UniProtKB/Swiss-Prot annotation, chains A, B, D, E, G:
GO cellular component, one term: ferritin complex
Binding site for Fe(2+) Fe2: E50, E93, E126, H129
Chain ranges of the Ferritin-like diiron domain: 1-144
Reactions the enzyme catalyzes: 4 Fe(2+) + O2 + 4 H(+) = 4 Fe(3+) + 2 H2O; Fe(2+)(in) = Fe(2+)(out)
Protein name: Bacterioferritin BfrB
UniProt organism field: Pseudomonas aeruginosa (strain ATCC 15692 / DSM 22644 / CIP 104116 / JCM 14847 / LMG 12228 / 1C / PRS 101 / PAO1)
Curated annotation (Swiss-Prot), chains C, F:
Sequence positions that bind heme b: M50
Binding site for Fe(2+) Fe2: E49, E92, E125, H128
Source organism: Pseudomonas aeruginosa (strain ATCC 15692 / DSM 22644 / CIP 104116 / JCM 14847 / LMG 12228 / 1C / PRS 101 / PAO1)
Binding site for K(+): N146, Q149
EC number(s) stated in the UniProt entry for this protein: 1.16.3.1
Subunit details: The bacterioferritin (BFR) complex is formed of 24 subunits (FtnA and BfrB) arranged as 12 homodimers. The holocomplex contains about 8.7% Fe and 8.0% phosphate. A pure BfrB BFR is a hollow shell with an external diameter of 118 Angstroms and an internal diameter of 73 Angstroms that binds 12 heme molecules and up to 600 Fe(3+) ions per subunit. The BfrB-only BFR has twenty-four ferroxidase pores which serve as a conduit for Fe(2+).
Family classification: Belongs to the bacterioferritin family.
CDD domains, alphabetized: Bacterioferritin
Name by which UniProt lists this protein: Bacterioferritin BfrB
Cellular component per GO, a single term: cytosol
Amino acid sequence: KGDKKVIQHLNKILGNELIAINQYFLHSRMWNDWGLKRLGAHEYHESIDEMKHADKLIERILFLEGLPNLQDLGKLLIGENTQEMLQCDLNLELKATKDLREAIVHCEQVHDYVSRDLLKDILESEEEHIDYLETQLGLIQKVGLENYLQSHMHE
Amino acid sequence: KGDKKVIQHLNKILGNELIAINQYFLHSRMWNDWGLKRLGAHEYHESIDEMKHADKLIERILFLEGLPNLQDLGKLLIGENTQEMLQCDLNLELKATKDLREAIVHCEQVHDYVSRDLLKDILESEEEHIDYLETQLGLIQKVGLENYLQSHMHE
Amino acid sequence: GDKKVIQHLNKILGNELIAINQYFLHSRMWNDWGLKRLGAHEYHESIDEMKHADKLIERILFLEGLPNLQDLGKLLIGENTQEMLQCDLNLELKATKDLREAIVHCEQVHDYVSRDLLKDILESEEEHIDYLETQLGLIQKVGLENYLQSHMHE
Amino acid sequence: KGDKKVIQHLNKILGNELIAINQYFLHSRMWNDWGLKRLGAHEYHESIDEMKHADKLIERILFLEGLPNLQDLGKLLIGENTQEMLQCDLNLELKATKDLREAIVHCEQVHDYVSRDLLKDILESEEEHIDYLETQLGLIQKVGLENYLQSHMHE
Amino acid sequence: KGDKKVIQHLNKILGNELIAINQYFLHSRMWNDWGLKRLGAHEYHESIDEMKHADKLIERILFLEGLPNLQDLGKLLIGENTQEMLQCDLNLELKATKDLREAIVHCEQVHDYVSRDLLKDILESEEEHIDYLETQLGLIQKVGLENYLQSHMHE
Amino acid sequence: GDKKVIQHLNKILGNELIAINQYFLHSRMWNDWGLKRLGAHEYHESIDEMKHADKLIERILFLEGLPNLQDLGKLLIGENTQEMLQCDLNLELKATKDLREAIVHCEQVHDYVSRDLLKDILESEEEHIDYLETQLGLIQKVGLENYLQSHMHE
Amino acid sequence: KGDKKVIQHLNKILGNELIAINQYFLHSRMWNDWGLKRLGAHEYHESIDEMKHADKLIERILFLEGLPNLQDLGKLLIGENTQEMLQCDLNLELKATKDLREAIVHCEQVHDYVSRDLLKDILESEEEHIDYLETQLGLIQKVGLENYLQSHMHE
Ligand code: HEM
Ligand code: HEM
Ligand code: HEM
Ligand SMILES: [Fe+2]
Ligand SMILES: [Fe+2]
Ligand SMILES: [Fe+2]
Ligand SMILES: [Fe+2]
Ligand SMILES: [Fe+2]
Ligand SMILES: [Fe+2]
Ligand SMILES: [Fe+2]
Ligand SMILES: [Fe+2]
Ligand SMILES: [Fe+2]
Ligand SMILES: [Fe+2]
Ligand SMILES: [Fe+2]
Ligand SMILES: [Fe+2]
Ligand SMILES: [Fe+2]
Ligand SMILES: [Fe+2]
Ligand SMILES: [Fe+2]
Ligand SMILES: [Fe+2]
Ligand SMILES: [Fe+2]
Ligand SMILES: [Fe+2]
Ligand SMILES: [Fe+2]
Ligand SMILES: [Fe+2]
Ligand SMILES: [Fe+2]
Ligand SMILES: [Fe+2]
Ligand SMILES: [Fe+2]
Ligand SMILES: [Fe+2]
Ligand SMILES: [Fe+2]
Ligand SMILES: [Fe+2]
Ligand SMILES: [Fe+2]
Ligand SMILES: [Fe+2]
Ligand SMILES: [Fe+2]
Ligand SMILES: [Fe+2]
Ligand SMILES: [K+]
């Protein structure tokens, strides 16, 4: 039996994963639909990463005797072109990261160091997502948008 | 976009790494030159470890949007014989480790748990290095210097 | 070892030290920017100079000198790809100039084994210079954006 | 032995092979030098094709008890940028093809059907070179000079 | 950008390579045509050697920002029988080797050590060519002409 | 072939021939004492010099001179391992000095291929010198008995 | 402690091995230099065999507590053409064989049966050398000098 405020945080984090999963899945398919297959494939793997984050959160919530909340789906940020799509993912990650850090503070406070550890490993992974996303946005500026999309057409 | 003092702490640690890379590479080659090829190889391994520490710090700094400092090289503690060389390496590692604990404190205070994780990984490895060095100096007292060196002539 | 040979060899060593750190930082800068093929090529240049330094350090010790790894000259760090290449080029041209003077001096005291070491390093520095001048040249011919594009993925 | 006029024709064709060898090898090496390595390698291949054409003409001429002329080297057409280099190669090929068709007419007239066959193989291969070259000058127009060159940087 | 006088020397060494390629290639095929195929294969290999020296010289000239001269072809020294053919190659190598020594001296004088090194490699191979050729001429004296040729009929 | 270059090559060859016998005797002296690792290493030095000799012999003949395997100068034979190592070191320092002078002469008459050969030999002699000095330094640092002990078994 | 006179016999045999090693090495390289490579390969094998005999004599002498003499080198018999070379080698082997028989008597006389055995093996090998050398001299008479040298040009 875990602490109630930590379980609530785990659920908040899980809520954030549920959004990211659907948002990235849809963006991946949007990119695939437009023949930008490489963007589509990379986004798809981002989506699978969030699905695994979720899975670990769900196991942890149950082990601590909480109820995993898969019912509440927050606001998807869907873009209409590849540059908005990248910025929408990036805004979602920055929000996920704020929430991860407050959850980690809470775990530390009540000595739930195993939850803390799970949260730190997700955070490292969201920081990599941010890195990738900011880099793509930078590349579009350095190589020009048309060139960037050309380079992400074929796998 | 990370904290200014965290970046500065990472640059400090990076500075300690750069020192260790040069001191250890030089010690390693001095040992090879003397035909103490086992001590040379091991010291070469330590040098490569510190090169890999530097790499990871540089990448973290760049990602947090700081400027990695590879320009400032502190004082190399260069020994004149194997007992001095080991003790000089031990002195540098004890100093790197003190700096690493202070950097970790700050990362925790400002919620940069990914930087902290990197620093902890680096601290764990510096503590192995200290173990290696204290062990050697102890072996010199237990088996005698001439035996110690003889046992480290041939790889 | 002629004391002046050792001094030339420590001077080359000091150039190697600057190139190592300059190229390693430039490599990581390009990786950070997502230009991984430039990043990887530059990392490979950094490694070559680490190897030159190693051989310089072995030869100096053999001739009974003290390798200087304490003094680190000025890094030329660029802030965009063209400037980073030009910095790399400017460092190589300086390095190549010292190597030549060191080779003259080795010949004059008959340290022919030091001459051969340094001529091997020089050959590798001319290769580096060729790579650098070629990338500049290619930026002019294909355009900066296309050049960067073709160095994004490995 | 061979008809004297046929041997002269075979030598004129060899003469054209020797220009092309040298012109194509210099251009290959110019392209490599500029880091256009895909162009370089393809032009090197074209050079080698012509070395093999020379080799067969030399063998045939000696078999017909004629004297192969490798002393007279005509005018190399060297360009100073890639569009000029391709146009120079194409001008040379159109010249070579015209000489080939006239050597073949003459072989037919004097019943030297084996030399005709060798000449026809060479002609088929020059026709492939012409196609390669016209196609490249065409792609320059369709994809733009810069994009064309970009796509022939790396092998 | 290399030394004007160095580039002019490299072009003179190139001129010598271009003469040797054609001369040895013709000699090779004359020997093949006569059924002396071992002599023919060996001379072909010498030909290939020279082509490879040419390629090296061309790359270096282009790297020193010079203009390689494949336009001028000096005088082929062509023999009528195996003894004259070997002697003509030998005459040509000795001239080549004299030019090599002069160019090396010049590279040394202006500190182009990488060009000197290229030219020394070529020189070592030309001295191997001279050794080969002198040895054959000696063997023709020791074993008699007819025996020499008989031993070079089949590969 | 230039006559003074040929006489310089024959002089290098005379040094190689001394080195071969001295090193081979030293090797078998060490094997006979049961210091087999020293013996094996000395044997490998001996073979190196046999290969140096072979190479000089071919060059001398190509240049149309007469190789001299008739004159065999003074072997430096030690009586214990320190002294045997020091004799070899004194022979290498002599050899190296003659090498430098021959190389000077080859350069002055433009025999660059002979110079290349001599410079490869020299590089190898300087490696032999580094092995030798290094073993002598190791006797001082680990003790003569320890050093011998670590060179008993292969 | 070996018998002083056996050790002096052993050193005389070793003296002969050292002359043979140098004489055959040089004749081998003279054959290679002349392009007579099969003669040269075989002579080289002979020189190697004498190097092995010298090796075994050295070990024996040192085991018997004697001083091996590698300082004194007797007269090389060097020839100027292939017939002289072989006859020179033959004169050196007959001289070696006479000294070997005398050492074997001495060994037997003082009961050093292991030395006699080492020398017996050496003798059998010198007799094989003699067979090879007289056989080649015979062959020159039967097939002619020029045919003989022709058959020994290529390996
Ligand atoms: C005196 C300065 C240095 C010397 C002498 C030196 C020498 C070397 C050598 C010999 C190697 C292995 C080369 C090989 O693959 O054969 C190496 C590897 C490496 N170095 Fe350095 N180095 C120096 C400085 C640095 C610095 C400043 C960095 C900065 C991060 C660095 C990062 C690396 C990395 C990432 C590797 C590859 C390690 C691996 O094997 O995974 N080195 N260094
Ligand atoms: C008469 C003029 C020439 C003739 C007849 C000729 C003939 C040949 C032939 C038959 C080959 C082998 C082709 C194969 O792969 O089957 C060859 C290869 C080659 N040629 Fe030429 N060649 C000539 C001139 C040149 C010139 C002027 C160059 C200047 C660089 C050159 C450079 C080369 C090179 C680099 C190769 C590849 C050799 C190797 O790597 O094995 N050739 N040549
Ligand atoms: C005391 C005089 C010498 C002794 C005792 C000696 C002994 C030996 C031995 C034991 C070997 C290894 C043979 C085997 O079993 O394969 C060898 C190889 C060889 N020797 Fe000598 N040798 C002597 C002098 C010479 C001389 C004067 C030369 C002239 C160059 C020479 C040239 C060679 C060469 C080229 C090899 C083959 C090395 C290799 O590539 O492995 N040796 N010698
Ligand atoms: Fe996630
Ligand atoms: Fe909380
Ligand atoms: Fe994420
Ligand atoms: Fe990408
Ligand atoms: Fe497509
Ligand atoms: Fe470290
Ligand atoms: Fe702090
Ligand atoms: Fe450390
Ligand atoms: Fe370098
Ligand atoms: Fe100087
Ligand atoms: Fe460089
Ligand atoms: Fe053709
Ligand atoms: Fe006609
Ligand atoms: Fe063609
Ligand atoms: Fe193409
Ligand atoms: Fe590239
Ligand atoms: Fe050549
Ligand atoms: Fe000149
Ligand atoms: Fe040649
Ligand atoms: Fe036949
Ligand atoms: Fe030697
Ligand atoms: Fe001299
Ligand atoms: Fe040596
Ligand atoms: Fe050892
Ligand atoms: Fe034992
Ligand atoms: Fe023998
Ligand atoms: Fe007797
Ligand atoms: Fe024998
Ligand atoms: Fe035979
Ligand atoms: Fe042959
Ligand atoms: K493009």
